[PDB]
């Protein structure tokens, strides 16, 4: 079971420096390269670097040396990304992939990276209530990116349409929505989760009939 | 560094059609080693980057065989054939043979379905979020065909948004359009209306409540 466990969500002051960490399992840590690959809306993919935690040399892109460090802790299999000279140019997700023989086989899941002064805002989260019937819960006012939504636990999770959030006003807002037969709501219970790892919050909405 | 240029930037397909896309460096991407480091990666909505094809034309184990690449030099290939639903998402090719490793710019693969008419869904403001002092009226256009679609708010029937990517199991866009005001101006109006325009049927789909 190789996993490269990131964490979903960062968010530093702009001039600070941050350490993200990619956590191996599953295999022989020290074998295996690990690369950093940064994803910014608009610009495609961007390779950072590499480390070797056998060798201990990291590579690194030019383009972000004197911004980069790349570190390597054989004992607790982590590999670590420290960012310093913060801007909102670094605002992205960054992945950890390992390779060896045949490219990045396995992947982080990518952590979400906010440079902005302003505070963490956990979301309010609102019921939508109205043969088929759509229900839907909306994500109102949070900070930073992201937030996950599965519905009843992940149990429910064909008919879901989750959409990317728009910011207005500095504050993050996403609507959900799941279409279920009619026959089994509000028999069968149904129920919006809701998590902002960056404020380490989570929040179960039941879409109650009225 | 080394350029990766991608053409296409956009491929819609239709199901079951081939497809090709491809990759050109500016220069050339054979290692000192006498191998070629390109590899193909897929990254599909919400997920993680997939490794299909490593040293030009390698499958990496687990992809479907409809994937082929091929290519010498500074041109290179990835082939589909019978493209399938699945298949949606951006590609890239990446070199990595010459520091700084570089990633071509990436081609949207969009599947290309018959007409589907949006299924349009209004939203009254919840208690809790009128008890909180706000008014959101929330409109879903699920399940339409093709991507672009108007949409219109009206108050009264006076003039007063969110795009899903491609669902990988009907080839087929949702969006979502929220209206934000006041709870004191949403107490003193009665019909709200959400209209949606598409490329499918003569007349608007509307939507409204009191
Ligand atoms: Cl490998």
């Known amino acids: 079971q190789v996993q490269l466990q990131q964490s979903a969500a960062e968010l530093a002051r702009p001039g600070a420096s941050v350490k993200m960490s990619c956590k191996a399992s599953?295999?022989?840590?020290?074998?295996?390269?690990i690369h950093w690959v940064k994803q910014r809306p608009g610009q495609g993919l961007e390779w950072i670097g590499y480390?070797?935690?056998?060798?201990?040399?990291?590579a690194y892109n030019q383009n972000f040396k004197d911004e980069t460090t790349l570190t390597a802790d054989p004992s607790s299999s982590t590999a670590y990304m420290e960012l310093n000279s913060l801007t909102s140019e670094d605002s992205a997700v960054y992945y950890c992939?390992?390779?060896?023989?045949?490219?990045?086989?396995?992947w982080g899941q990518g952590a979400t990276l906010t440079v902005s002064s302003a505070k963490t805002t956990p979301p309010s989260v609102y019921p939508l209530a109205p043969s088929m019937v759509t229900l839907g819960c909306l994500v109102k006012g949070y900070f930073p990116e992201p937030v996950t939504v599965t519905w009843n636990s992940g149990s429910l999770s064909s008919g879901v349409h989750t959409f990317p959030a728009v910011l207005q006003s500095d504050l993050y807002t996403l609507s959900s929505s799941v279409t279920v037969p009619s026959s089994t709501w509000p028999s069968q219970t149904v129920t919006c989760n809701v998590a902002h790892p960056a404020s380490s919050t989570k929040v179960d909405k039941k879409i109650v009939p009225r | 560094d080394v350029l990766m240029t991608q053409i296409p930037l956009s491929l819609p397909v239709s199901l079951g059609d081939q497809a090709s896309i491809s990759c050109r460096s500016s220069q050339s991407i054979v290692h000192r080693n006498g191998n070629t480091y390109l590899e193909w990666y897929l990254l599909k909505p919400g997920q993680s980057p997939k490794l299909l094809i490593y040293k030009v034309s390698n499958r990496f184990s687990g992809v479907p065989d409809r994937f082929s690449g091929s290519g010498s030099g500074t041109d290179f290939t990835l082939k589909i054939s019978r493209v399938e639903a699945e298949d949606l998402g951006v590609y890239y090719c990446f070199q990595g043979s010459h520091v700084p490793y570089t990633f071509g710019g990436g081609t949207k693969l969009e599947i290309r379905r018959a007409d589907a008419a949006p299924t349009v869904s209004i939203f009254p403001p919840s208690s809790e979020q009128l008890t909180s002092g706000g008014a959101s009226v929330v409109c879903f256009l699920n399940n339409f065909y093709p991507k672009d679609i108007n949409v219109k708010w009206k108050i009264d029937g006076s003039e007063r948004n969110s795009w899903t990517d491609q669902d990988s199991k009907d080839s087929t866009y949702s969006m979502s359009s929220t209206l934000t005001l006041t709870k004191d101006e949403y107490e003193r109006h009665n019909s709200y209306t959400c209209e949606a325009t598409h490329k499918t049927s003569t007349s608007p789909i509307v939507k409204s409540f009191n």
């Open positions: 480390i070797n935690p056998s060798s201990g040399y990291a």
């Open positions: 992939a390992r390779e060896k023989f045949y490219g990045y086989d396995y």
């Open positions: 599953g295999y022989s840590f020290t074998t295996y390269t």
